[PDB]
Sequence to fold (1127 residues):
Amino acid sequence: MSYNYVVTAQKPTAVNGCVTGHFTSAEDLNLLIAKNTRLEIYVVTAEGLRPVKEVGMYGKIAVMELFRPKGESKDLLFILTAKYNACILEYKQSGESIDIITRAHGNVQDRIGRPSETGIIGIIDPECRMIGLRLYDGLFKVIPLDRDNKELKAFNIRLEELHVIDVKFLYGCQAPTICFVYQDPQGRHVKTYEVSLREKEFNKGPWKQENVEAEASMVIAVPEPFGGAIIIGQESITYHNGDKYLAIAPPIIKQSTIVCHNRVDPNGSRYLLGDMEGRLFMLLLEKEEQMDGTVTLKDLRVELLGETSIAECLTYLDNGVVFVGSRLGDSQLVKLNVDSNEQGSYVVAMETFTNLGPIVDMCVVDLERQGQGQLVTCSGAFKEGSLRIIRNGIGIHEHASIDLPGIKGLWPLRSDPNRETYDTLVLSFVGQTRVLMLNGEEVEETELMGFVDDQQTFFCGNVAHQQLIQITSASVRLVSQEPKALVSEWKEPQAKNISVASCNSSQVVVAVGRALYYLQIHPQELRQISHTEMEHEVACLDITPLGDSNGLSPLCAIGLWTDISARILKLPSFELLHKEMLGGEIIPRSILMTTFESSHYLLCALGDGALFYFGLNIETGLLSDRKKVTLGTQPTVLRTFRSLSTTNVFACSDRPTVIYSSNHKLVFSNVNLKEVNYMCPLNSDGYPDSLALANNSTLTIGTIDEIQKLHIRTVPLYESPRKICYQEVSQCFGVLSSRIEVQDTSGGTTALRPSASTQALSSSVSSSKLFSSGEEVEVHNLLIIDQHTFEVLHAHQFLQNEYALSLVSCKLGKDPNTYFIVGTAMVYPEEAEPKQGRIVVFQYSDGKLQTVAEKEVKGAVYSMVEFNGKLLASINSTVRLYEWTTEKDVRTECNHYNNIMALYLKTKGDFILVGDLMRSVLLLAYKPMEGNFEEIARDFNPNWMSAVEILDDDNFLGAENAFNLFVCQKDSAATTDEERQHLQEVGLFHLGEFVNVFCHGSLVMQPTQGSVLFGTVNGMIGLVTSLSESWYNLLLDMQNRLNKVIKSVGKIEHSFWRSFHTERKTEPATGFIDGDLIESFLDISRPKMQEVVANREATADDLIKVVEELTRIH
Amino acid sequence: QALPALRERELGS
Fold:
């Protein structure tokens, strides 16, 4: 029994595919970017991309095409999951509520059929007559496109050729006709088949099988004016037709393989081409005319336009704008100019979108000496390589810290109408008021004339027309910028005390307990206006001139005491509109209004910390959407702030939250602060652009961070990092990198660009002499990286043809020094595997990288961990436990041996080990008997491992090539000379993500138990946690209910998606709860929410809170 | 080889 809960802490950032077309509106341009499982939907603008709709799916997208048949208005979408899920999508707006529909769907796999090289190829014919699929090796799948076929019934046709490389449909062919590059013992060839769907046959294509090159890897079909097939290999480009053939081998393209393409002009004149280098080519075909038939071709030449992130996906948009989909680096928006600049680049970067890319390796490191952890992932590859420092929450830059206990408010102020650098600030004190004027950065408490300092201030804002306002318990006083005394004054015509207050430039609304008054400010005098009484006692008010008026405010709204409500009203007339009745038993503490780009928002905060969101129109004055969140458990004070262009909302609480803007939505995320009571914007000539803060005691000021939950740094390495270690006693990261170099004319290698190891601040190479007995070679490095600066303190280069595989930072035995230990291997392309290698013990000093001790090994050092003052390495297949003499030298002790290829290791504290390559996992014990290994138990399934972590003394988490997670634990039954020997698979699961690395740590803190983060190839960062017996049984069930209520996108069963899947079996998943689906609850309509709960107890609006305490593990 | 495979399995095909 192994109860587990996985969560997506960060969505996959790798673009896996993208397309253009009119999917939103027949007169709209759309960018359709598929991630792994996500599907971003954009519309193109003068700026670039307007986000529109982002949805997940239950599957890895592998095919994504837009198509528009006859008798259809706008383009429809066709998606095919890697688990062979076909489905046809459509975008459908009901005015303001946006929906993606399922027009067709089915499952298009067969029991028979090896999946082939290059994997899935899906293609639609130009006439929309069908959908052709090469799912399987040797067959071709047809989905005959009809008005019927809502379940996409598909017939297969036999293929004589069982190795296809690429296939397209050809324009201008009588029937539907395919075109492809196949392989056989003679080499590579081109062939066409006419696909008649009447007879379910393949007939014969419009032109005879010709011959393409022994590296051909792309068929590009060409549109109506031309017709034909452009075929791309290495070092050559061919154009094929009836008997027309054209070819060119431009030395430029030879250098690296053209990987992805794309048509720029509809008439198929200009095409874009991607490389492993990131080079952006322009394929141009020359128009030739005989003038009475159509148009032929004279030639076709290729020009190098510039440089992109290693393009996996490619799409031209409106005007020059090219979206570059990267997998190994940050995707980006790129402009094609007509003119070159410096270095001859017709390419100009517009925007660069953060891809956390191939996460090869990472670790959890504080770097702030708090309790929270930053994560530092080795991301990217080749020129795109980088470290990413991922920091959870928005943080504060502090400047001054004055110790004042019992502050009650603060508002922006100036003592000169000229400078907008607010040189003053007045705070509310414990029934008192003290002045704070600034000599600059000097905190000065004096008296100010016309301001009372023994009463308690309620408001103190910037009333324009030369005046300073001070509403307090009794009177609302007034000061000017000409005399500075009692310029005017207002008093309640009874001697009753004012309670609630709201004020802007030339407008004031107060409350005397149910009583209301509206004021005005002009030159020098305080003039009163209208008055109305109200149902109960006023708890809060708000007034502010919005985006439709200059200093004066149109409509209005409040919330009062007894009924516990939120009232919509008018201002001068004081009439009552459509209030929103609220539940609860505590007052509403704060109420506000805001404006961003497009929309107006009415927010109300409660006393027990909760918050409700509604939309008050500047015109209509009507309701909007309802939902409940938790913040802290204290009252929440709502303020407005200046940041960038989008100026936003700060929620003060015991758990401080900020409200930015995402796409049109309002962000809602944590703020790294002790506890925050009251807050305001600033801009003094001692602290500009600052935000002011107060709590129990102590003021703070200083600029605010970014937006979002996850902050991302990025330290561009320009090469490719393999693993990372954190020596904290040293205050620096050790990172293994790798650069590719080219054979040169003399006999050595050089470099292609300035990398991290080359332009390193200080370097050293290896001197060991232990070995004897069109060319690219990887060069490897340890890098020393300052944790504060992230500069390259040092870069050590390893030997020739030596790769550095593994890294540890530890103290070994009674050696007081901490070390860097690097496992390595010697690689040359004859041997299938290494039969050599090293183990180097590096020591970093004041600022010096010392080679302390080396050791030879007859095989690759795959991983290694600090066991117990002893070093535990895996050497190709022997797993050996080294110890550390006083000699300062690695001496052997024991070494197991029952492995195929020991790729990974993890240590459970005391004396326990794990992990293999193509035969699942093992479990070992070190015996302080004679320092001898004893194989405790092993998993007997045939998994192709990729990642291993020990969760606890029994739960072992493994990840594997087929994107599946599993969990092992030892059988606790009798007859333990056999049943002990096997450890059973107590939990399977389909993440749908290649897992590179696991480790312990959390991105938060100063309901569950444990915490294990993982990084994946697609850049997704996950979180595994272990569960308590009851919490599972509830969650698995409420997970089962959610399937019935949530309408799947491609109409895909969630339980199917989550099922364990290798080529040779499929099981439904046990012991695994994706909180992703659990988190799906909090974004449900209340009607479909009540459904989930029909049935120790079961509530309704109590689970809404349990799913809260979950979205707080990351 | 075994390693030319292992710096490509950490990246994807």
About this structure: The interface with chain A takes residues 1-4, 6-7, 9-12 of chain B (CB under 8 Å). Chain B is about 0% helix and 0% strand. The radius of gyration of chain B is 6 Å. The CA atoms of residues 4 and 13 of chain B lie 12 Å apart.
